[PDB]
Amino acid sequence: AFEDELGAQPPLGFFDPLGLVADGDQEKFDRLRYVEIKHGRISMLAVVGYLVQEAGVRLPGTIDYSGKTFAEIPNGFAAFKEIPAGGLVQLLFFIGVLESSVMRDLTGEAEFVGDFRNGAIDFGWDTFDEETQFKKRAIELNQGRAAQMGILALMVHEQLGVSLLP
Amino acid sequence: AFEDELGAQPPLGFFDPLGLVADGDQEKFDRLRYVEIKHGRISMLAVVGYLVQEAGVRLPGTIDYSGKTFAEIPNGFAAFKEIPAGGLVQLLFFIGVLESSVMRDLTGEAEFVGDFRNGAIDFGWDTFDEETQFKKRAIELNQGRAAQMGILALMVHEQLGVSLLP
Ligand code: CLA
Ligand code: CLA
Ligand code: CLA
Ligand code: CLA
Ligand code: CLA
Ligand code: CLA
Ligand SMILES: CC(=O)O[C@H]1CC(C)(C)C(=C=C/C(C)=C/C=C/C(C)=C/C=C/C=C(C)/C=C/C=C(\C)C(=O)C[C@@]23O[C@]2(C)C[C@@H](O)CC3(C)C)[C@](C)(O)C1
Ligand SMILES: CC(=O)O[C@H]1CC(C)(C)C(=C=C/C(C)=C/C=C/C(C)=C/C=C/C=C(C)/C=C/C=C(\C)C(=O)C[C@@]23O[C@]2(C)C[C@@H](O)CC3(C)C)[C@](C)(O)C1
Ligand SMILES: [Ca+2]
Ligand SMILES: [Ca+2]
Ligand SMILES: [Ca+2]
Ligand SMILES: [Ca+2]
């Protein structure tokens, strides 16, 4: 059914040990694929952010008018103890607004799930041939899969207190 | 242009002292009307909630597993000092999900701005005749306008420390 879909590749081939898409429902597959791409994009950004922040890189100066500095804010979950309440509200709200109003198929012209270009932002999708376009989608998906496991590893081991970083 | 639209009624008639819709742009009017209905629905719920909560009505029992009781939580802005962080996150998140996925025209079948029935929930809109339907929309809008001023009054006077309630 979906043995030929994007994401079935060497060395495992089509890999669905829980038969989640064995029923051949295209809409179920389309949703799960949407969810898989989304977790992957978030996790790709999350691993880079965790590593950059772990290395001590900080925005210059202060995060609020009381004089709280980005430099005082630690990496990991501990960051949330030191970001001011108003900043946490804004971060959650403005990610929510991406979810409600931006990062979605607004016009119905998406070529496949995860295509949010919306006839608005495009760096040249059609300059890739069909094989290259498929390759780029596969890289996006599989980098996303690897990063999902990577960010889970970093979050878990932060709590374990067994570091995975030099 | 919009002198005959919903919301222009006695005693003021069409009332736009800032000429915001003087340009006759239907899409600008449609947006502003959408925003006016939305503030009004929120404010209608807000005034009732503030008054019910001010009267001391509380949900039974505890709001978290640490034993924090609804009864310990005060009315007004002070409530946010005592709702646990996890509850504040959930409240904001689940209102955001209403915004991203529920309280909007998902199907394009809305009869006018603010119609979120979505072919899914309808208690009998078409059992009203056209005059009654217009009357009900006018009540919804003007109750919303009154409640906007009412909730602003209550929030402002809470901070003034000059109570408007017996
Ligand atoms: C207020 C902000 C906001 C809003 C309004 C939304 C709105 C939405 N998001 Mg988004 N999201 C946000 C912030 C927000 N998001 C943030 C900050 C992140 C992190 C960057 C994400 C990451 C995210 C992902 C990864 C996904 C969504 C999805 C969704 C949609 C479904 C939400 C749902 O059904 O409830 C949620 C319902 C639940 C039952 C919650 C599920 C909890 C998951 C399965 C496990 C989480 C584990 C937890 C974090 C750790 C446990 C603790 C541990 C000790 C055990 C909706 C469009 C989903 C989507 O698009 O579906 C098609 C989806 O897959 N969002
Ligand atoms: C994470 C949760 C979440 C998410 C994702 C959204 C998402 C959205 N909301 Mg919603 N909303 C939420 C929570 C959320 N809302 C909550 C909790 C409430 C209260 C119940 C509302 C009430 C609300 C209203 C009333 C309106 C929206 C609107 C919108 C849309 C536009 C948002 C925007 O452009 O940025 C916001 C951009 C800004 C520049 C912020 C404007 C700030 C306003 C003008 C003044 C606020 C004054 C402030 C509270 C008090 C000042 C302090 C004082 C001491 C001076 C978008 C669909 C708007 C909409 O549908 O537009 C068509 C709209 O009119 N929302
Ligand atoms: C939320 C994340 C998410 C989602 C929705 C999907 C969804 C999908 N994947 Mg994918 N995948 C993911 C993460 C995800 N994957 C990660 C992180 C990896 C790397 C390990 C992969 C690697 C992968 C391969 C190699 C293949 C798929 C395939 C598929 C498709 C069919 C199989 C299936 O149902 O999924 C998998 C299972 C689920 C979505 C069920 C969720 C798991 C439950 C709810 C909790 C389990 C938590 C788990 C124990 C965490 C520990 C990790 C483990 C290694 C110990 C479907 C579109 C196949 C495909 O593309 O077919 C065309 C395919 O060949 N996936
Ligand atoms: C999962 C992604 C993610 C999350 C949730 C966070 C969360 C956080 N970061 Mg981090 N960060 C990330 C990725 C992430 N970061 C990446 C990829 C980088 C490298 C550029 C950084 C670099 C960075 C620095 C240097 C600092 C933080 C800081 C912080 C904290 C305060 C908020 C802030 O200043 O943000 C700042 C956020 C950035 C500088 C980059 C965010 C990039 C986002 C994820 C882009 C993604 C969405 C985008 C709109 C997509 C547009 C597409 C387009 C086509 C329209 C907070 C814990 C500050 C702190 O206190 O650290 C402890 C701080 O000093 N971050
Ligand atoms: C966010 C709330 C909001 C929004 C978007 C609108 C939008 C609209 N109203 Mg409405 N209205 C509101 C709140 C709102 N109203 C409230 C609270 C009341 C009761 C006082 C009314 C009473 C009202 C009447 C009687 C009429 C309208 C009309 C209209 C339409 C054209 C006039 C206009 O541009 O609006 C008004 C102005 C604005 C949206 C600009 C915003 C104001 C700025 C940004 C800040 C001002 C803050 C202010 C000082 C707070 C103090 C309150 C004041 C009494 C001291 C338009 C659809 C007319 C109509 O329906 O035409 C068909 C009409 O006849 N409105
Ligand atoms: C603007 C609306 C609004 C807001 C933001 C709040 C916010 C709050 N309320 Mg209040 N409340 C409201 C309206 C509101 N309330 C109304 C209308 C009532 C009467 C039913 C109450 C009755 C009430 C009680 C009895 C208690 C609170 C409490 C609380 C606090 C903790 C959260 C909680 O337990 O919620 C509980 C919320 C409710 C019991 C009712 C919320 C009704 C919402 C607004 C319905 C609106 C959306 C809905 C999904 C629309 C569906 C449409 C459909 C066609 C699909 C928090 C400060 C608790 C607290 O600590 O107080 C200090 C508490 O004990 N509220
Ligand atoms: C123009 C503008 O304004 O914006 C534009 C700019 C531009 C460029 C055009 C755009 C784009 C494309 C973007 C942003 C592409 C981003 C790509 C990105 C960010 C890709 C990350 C992959 C990470 C992986 C695979 C990690 C696996 C991690 C794994 C498997 C781990 O184990 C983690 C690890 O830690 C452990 C657990 C232990 C450590 O011992 C070792 C390591 C570190 C390995 C956008 C989207 O259009 C927006
Ligand atoms: C089936 C289900 O599951 O749900 C369904 C149920 C049902 C019923 C079918 C549905 C509905 C309809 C609903 C929920 C309708 C709600 C209507 C509602 C809640 C209407 C409030 C008006 C408030 C106004 C005008 C306040 C002005 C307030 C003013 C002008 C003030 O000055 C405030 C005031 O405080 C001052 C400042 C000083 C005080 O001295 C005096 C007072 C108090 C006056 C939904 C939506 O379909 C959902
Ligand atoms: Ca300091
Ligand atoms: Ca610190
Ligand atoms: Ca107690
Ligand atoms: Ca208390």
Short mmCIF file of N, CA and C in Angstrom, two decimals, chain B residues 80-154:
data_model
loop_
_atom_site.label_atom_id
_atom_site.label_comp_id
_atom_site.label_asym_id
_atom_site.label_seq_id
_atom_site.Cartn_x
_atom_site.Cartn_y
_atom_site.Cartn_z
N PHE B 80 -3.94 34.49 38.93
CA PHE B 80 -2.81 33.93 38.20
C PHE B 80 -1.62 33.66 39.10
N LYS B 81 -1.55 34.31 40.27
CA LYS B 81 -0.49 34.07 41.23
C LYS B 81 -0.63 32.72 41.91
N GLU B 82 -1.81 32.11 41.85
CA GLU B 82 -2.08 30.89 42.60
C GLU B 82 -2.46 29.70 41.73
N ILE B 83 -2.79 29.91 40.46
CA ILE B 83 -2.95 28.77 39.54
C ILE B 83 -1.57 28.20 39.25
N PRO B 84 -1.36 26.89 39.39
CA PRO B 84 -0.02 26.35 39.16
C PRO B 84 0.44 26.55 37.72
N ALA B 85 1.77 26.63 37.57
CA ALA B 85 2.38 26.87 36.27
C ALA B 85 1.84 25.93 35.22
N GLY B 86 1.69 24.65 35.57
CA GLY B 86 1.21 23.68 34.60
C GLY B 86 -0.20 23.95 34.16
N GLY B 87 -1.02 24.51 35.05
CA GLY B 87 -2.37 24.85 34.69
C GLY B 87 -2.42 26.06 33.78
N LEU B 88 -1.60 27.07 34.07
CA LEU B 88 -1.53 28.23 33.19
C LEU B 88 -1.08 27.84 31.79
N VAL B 89 -0.07 26.97 31.69
CA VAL B 89 0.37 26.49 30.38
C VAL B 89 -0.78 25.81 29.65
N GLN B 90 -1.49 24.91 30.35
CA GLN B 90 -2.59 24.19 29.72
C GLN B 90 -3.72 25.12 29.30
N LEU B 91 -4.10 26.07 30.16
CA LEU B 91 -5.14 27.02 29.78
C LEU B 91 -4.75 27.77 28.52
N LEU B 92 -3.53 28.30 28.47
CA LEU B 92 -3.13 29.05 27.28
C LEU B 92 -3.09 28.13 26.07
N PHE B 93 -2.50 26.95 26.23
CA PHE B 93 -2.39 26.02 25.11
C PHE B 93 -3.77 25.62 24.59
N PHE B 94 -4.69 25.27 25.47
CA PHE B 94 -5.95 24.77 24.93
C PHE B 94 -6.83 25.89 24.36
N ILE B 95 -6.69 27.14 24.83
CA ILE B 95 -7.32 28.25 24.13
C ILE B 95 -6.66 28.46 22.77
N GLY B 96 -5.33 28.36 22.71
CA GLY B 96 -4.65 28.40 21.43
C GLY B 96 -5.15 27.34 20.46
N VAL B 97 -5.42 26.13 20.96
CA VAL B 97 -5.91 25.08 20.06
C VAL B 97 -7.31 25.40 19.56
N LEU B 98 -8.17 25.99 20.41
CA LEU B 98 -9.44 26.51 19.89
C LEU B 98 -9.19 27.47 18.75
N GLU B 99 -8.17 28.32 18.89
CA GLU B 99 -7.89 29.33 17.88
C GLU B 99 -7.35 28.70 16.60
N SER B 100 -6.51 27.67 16.73
CA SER B 100 -5.87 27.11 15.54
C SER B 100 -6.75 26.11 14.82
N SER B 101 -7.67 25.46 15.52
CA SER B 101 -8.28 24.24 14.99
C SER B 101 -9.79 24.14 15.14
N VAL B 102 -10.45 25.08 15.82
CA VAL B 102 -11.87 24.93 16.17
C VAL B 102 -12.68 26.18 15.86
N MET B 103 -12.33 27.28 16.52
CA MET B 103 -13.15 28.50 16.47
C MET B 103 -12.74 29.34 15.27
N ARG B 104 -13.10 28.85 14.09
CA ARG B 104 -12.74 29.50 12.84
C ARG B 104 -13.58 28.86 11.74
N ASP B 105 -13.62 29.53 10.60
CA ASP B 105 -14.30 29.01 9.42
C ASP B 105 -13.38 28.01 8.74
N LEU B 106 -13.56 26.72 9.04
CA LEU B 106 -12.68 25.68 8.53
C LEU B 106 -13.07 25.23 7.13
N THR B 107 -14.36 25.26 6.82
CA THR B 107 -14.89 24.71 5.58
C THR B 107 -15.21 25.77 4.53
N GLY B 108 -15.15 27.05 4.87
CA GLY B 108 -15.56 28.08 3.94
C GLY B 108 -17.05 28.23 3.77
N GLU B 109 -17.87 27.54 4.56
CA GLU B 109 -19.31 27.60 4.38
C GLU B 109 -19.98 28.61 5.31
N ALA B 110 -19.19 29.37 6.08
CA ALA B 110 -19.76 30.38 6.97
C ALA B 110 -20.67 31.33 6.20
N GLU B 111 -21.82 31.67 6.80
CA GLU B 111 -22.74 32.58 6.13
C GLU B 111 -22.32 34.04 6.27
N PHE B 112 -21.50 34.34 7.27
CA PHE B 112 -20.99 35.67 7.57
C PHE B 112 -19.90 35.50 8.61
N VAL B 113 -19.08 36.54 8.79
CA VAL B 113 -18.00 36.44 9.77
C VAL B 113 -18.57 36.13 11.15
N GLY B 114 -17.88 35.23 11.86
CA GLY B 114 -18.26 34.80 13.18
C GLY B 114 -19.10 33.54 13.20
N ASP B 115 -19.56 33.10 12.03
CA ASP B 115 -20.31 31.85 11.88
C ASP B 115 -19.31 30.70 11.86
N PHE B 116 -19.16 29.99 12.99
CA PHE B 116 -18.23 28.88 13.11
C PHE B 116 -18.93 27.52 13.11
N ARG B 117 -20.22 27.47 12.76
CA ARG B 117 -20.96 26.21 12.84
C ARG B 117 -20.25 25.10 12.08
N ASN B 118 -19.65 25.43 10.93
CA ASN B 118 -18.76 24.52 10.21
C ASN B 118 -19.51 23.26 9.75
N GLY B 119 -20.81 23.38 9.47
CA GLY B 119 -21.58 22.21 9.09
C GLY B 119 -21.61 21.13 10.16
N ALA B 120 -21.19 21.46 11.39
CA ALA B 120 -20.99 20.47 12.44
C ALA B 120 -21.91 20.66 13.64
N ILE B 121 -22.08 21.87 14.16
CA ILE B 121 -22.94 22.11 15.32
C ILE B 121 -23.90 23.23 14.98
N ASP B 122 -25.20 22.95 15.09
CA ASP B 122 -26.25 23.91 14.73
C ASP B 122 -27.50 23.55 15.53
N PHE B 123 -27.98 24.48 16.35
CA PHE B 123 -29.19 24.26 17.14
C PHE B 123 -30.45 24.72 16.43
N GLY B 124 -30.37 25.05 15.14
CA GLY B 124 -31.56 25.39 14.39
C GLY B 124 -31.58 26.79 13.80
N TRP B 125 -30.41 27.28 13.36
CA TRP B 125 -30.32 28.60 12.76
C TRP B 125 -31.42 28.86 11.73
N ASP B 126 -31.71 27.88 10.88
CA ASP B 126 -32.69 28.09 9.83
C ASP B 126 -34.13 28.00 10.31
N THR B 127 -34.35 27.77 11.59
CA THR B 127 -35.72 27.89 12.08
C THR B 127 -36.08 29.33 12.42
N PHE B 128 -35.12 30.24 12.43
CA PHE B 128 -35.41 31.66 12.54
C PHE B 128 -35.65 32.22 11.15
N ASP B 129 -36.63 33.12 11.02
CA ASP B 129 -36.76 33.83 9.76
C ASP B 129 -35.68 34.91 9.64
N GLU B 130 -35.58 35.52 8.45
CA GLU B 130 -34.45 36.41 8.19
C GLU B 130 -34.43 37.59 9.15
N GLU B 131 -35.60 38.15 9.48
CA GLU B 131 -35.62 39.24 10.46
C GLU B 131 -35.16 38.76 11.83
N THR B 132 -35.67 37.61 12.28
CA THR B 132 -35.24 37.06 13.57
C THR B 132 -33.74 36.75 13.57
N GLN B 133 -33.23 36.14 12.49
CA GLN B 133 -31.79 35.88 12.40
C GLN B 133 -30.99 37.17 12.53
N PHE B 134 -31.40 38.23 11.84
CA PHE B 134 -30.71 39.51 11.96
C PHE B 134 -30.79 40.06 13.38
N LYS B 135 -31.97 39.97 14.01
CA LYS B 135 -32.12 40.41 15.40
C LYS B 135 -31.17 39.67 16.33
N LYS B 136 -31.10 38.34 16.18
CA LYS B 136 -30.23 37.57 17.06
C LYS B 136 -28.76 37.94 16.85
N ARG B 137 -28.37 38.23 15.60
CA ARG B 137 -26.99 38.66 15.37
C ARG B 137 -26.73 40.02 15.99
N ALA B 138 -27.74 40.89 15.96
CA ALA B 138 -27.59 42.21 16.56
C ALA B 138 -27.50 42.13 18.07
N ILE B 139 -28.30 41.25 18.68
CA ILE B 139 -28.19 41.04 20.13
C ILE B 139 -26.81 40.51 20.46
N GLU B 140 -26.35 39.51 19.70
CA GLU B 140 -25.03 38.96 20.01
C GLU B 140 -23.97 40.04 19.96
N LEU B 141 -24.03 40.90 18.94
CA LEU B 141 -23.02 41.93 18.75
C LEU B 141 -23.10 43.00 19.83
N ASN B 142 -24.32 43.44 20.16
CA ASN B 142 -24.43 44.55 21.08
C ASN B 142 -24.27 44.11 22.53
N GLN B 143 -24.77 42.93 22.90
CA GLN B 143 -24.36 42.37 24.18
C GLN B 143 -22.85 42.30 24.25
N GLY B 144 -22.20 41.91 23.15
CA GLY B 144 -20.75 41.85 23.14
C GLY B 144 -20.11 43.21 23.34
N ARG B 145 -20.67 44.25 22.69
CA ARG B 145 -20.15 45.61 22.89
C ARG B 145 -20.30 46.07 24.33
N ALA B 146 -21.49 45.87 24.91
CA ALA B 146 -21.69 46.25 26.30
C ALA B 146 -20.75 45.50 27.21
N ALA B 147 -20.56 44.20 26.96
CA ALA B 147 -19.72 43.41 27.84
C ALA B 147 -18.25 43.80 27.72
N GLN B 148 -17.80 44.21 26.53
CA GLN B 148 -16.44 44.74 26.38
C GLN B 148 -16.20 45.92 27.32
N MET B 149 -17.13 46.86 27.34
CA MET B 149 -17.00 47.98 28.25
C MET B 149 -17.13 47.52 29.69
N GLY B 150 -17.99 46.53 29.93
CA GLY B 150 -18.19 46.05 31.30
C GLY B 150 -16.94 45.39 31.85
N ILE B 151 -16.34 44.49 31.06
CA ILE B 151 -15.15 43.81 31.57
C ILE B 151 -13.99 44.78 31.68
N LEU B 152 -13.88 45.76 30.77
CA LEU B 152 -12.82 46.75 30.93
C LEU B 152 -12.99 47.52 32.23
N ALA B 153 -14.23 47.93 32.53
CA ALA B 153 -14.55 48.60 33.78
C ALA B 153 -14.13 47.78 34.99
N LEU B 154 -14.45 46.48 34.99
CA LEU B 154 -14.12 45.66 36.15
C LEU B 154 -12.62 45.48 36.29
#
